[model samples]
Target: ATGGYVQQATGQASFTMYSGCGSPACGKAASGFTAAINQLAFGSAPGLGAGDACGRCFALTGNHDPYSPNYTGPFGQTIVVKVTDLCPVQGNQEFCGQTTSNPTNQHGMPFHFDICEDTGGSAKFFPSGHGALTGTFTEVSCSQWSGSDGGQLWNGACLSGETAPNWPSTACGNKGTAPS
Candidate 1:
């Protein structure tokens, strides 16, 4: 546990299932399915220098919303994921389209974790219908991250889009955690 447990934050954890590579982030290089944190936390675009949050990991404790139509029952589950991508800032996009002045999304969540859903294990999360898993997240050491592919070690997996020739290889940082 290099950067140990950092601050905690309440947010929504949406499932990414098994999707294609994420845009201009480490997701393009990370093994198996990975997560894309909100742009606010993911830092600037790769053309500039990418984000400091890339390659970091976080622990998410699932929240069951009884009000949602997808609600089944309270089956609290905890999942740890690595920050391999960025949830891009799109126009009118409720999830990742937010700024510093108004950080929270349409659901009023300050942070959002677009996590990869494990085929067998994540079945428990659905229970038939549940959608986004609302929860609180705490920054944890990447060493504790165990995903579908067992686990991984951070290796400065930034995109090649970074300003050419002298591309900063360590733009993603060597630490197991990002600036909170």
Candidate 2:
């Protein structure tokens, strides 16, 4: 990827549409945005309740549901999402509703995306009625992203939830093109 975007990685991951911005990262800069990722994958600082992955962007392509490969409601659909929150882990849940050093979710996927369904007009890209999606993701630059109407999605901000003291003064990873 060019344009200052680093190809951080690529892998199979699970996707679920959720509606909430109360995530820890939702507190400061990324509040009310349209994307949330699992804590395991978000890599939030241990015991800190904060994620460094906030403000990161990724291009996601939908694949079939892992549990039912025949479920293809979201197949072939694509979307660009910016991280704004965390999907807290839950006990006894197949989704591994908890954060861990392990990269894989309960289903053994390398990552999990809890796509925020409240804004950015992105919910349409997902399927209805509890259907989930699995897909490939590539970290991308925020500058190249926008809504279908040529309007700034999520206000065109680089997006972050970190506060004054811990905030990195330099560019986010110096890989993204925008500044918060």
Compute each candidate's TM-score over C-alphas. Answer: 0.64, 0.64
Q: Which segments of candidate 2 are over 4 A away from where they belong?
A: 1-8, 22-26, 29-33, 45-49, 72-76, 96-102, 120-122, 147-180
Tens digit of per-residue lDDT, candidate 1, span 64-94: 5533746556654676666666676664266
Give, for candidate 2, the lowest lDDT window spanning 10 residues. 171-180
- Give per-residue CA lDDT, model 2, range 1-180, as digits (tens): 122211234667777776655433433334223566665545442234334455666778776677676664635457777666556554424553433334456677656777766664245556555357666777666653453211123332234422212222322222222101
Task: Tell me model 1's lDDT, rounded to 2 decimals.
Answer: 0.51
Model 1 clash pairs?
Answer: none
Cα lDDT, all candidates: 0.51, 0.51
**TM-score of model 2 relative to the true fold?**
0.64
Candidate 2, position 155, lDDT: 30
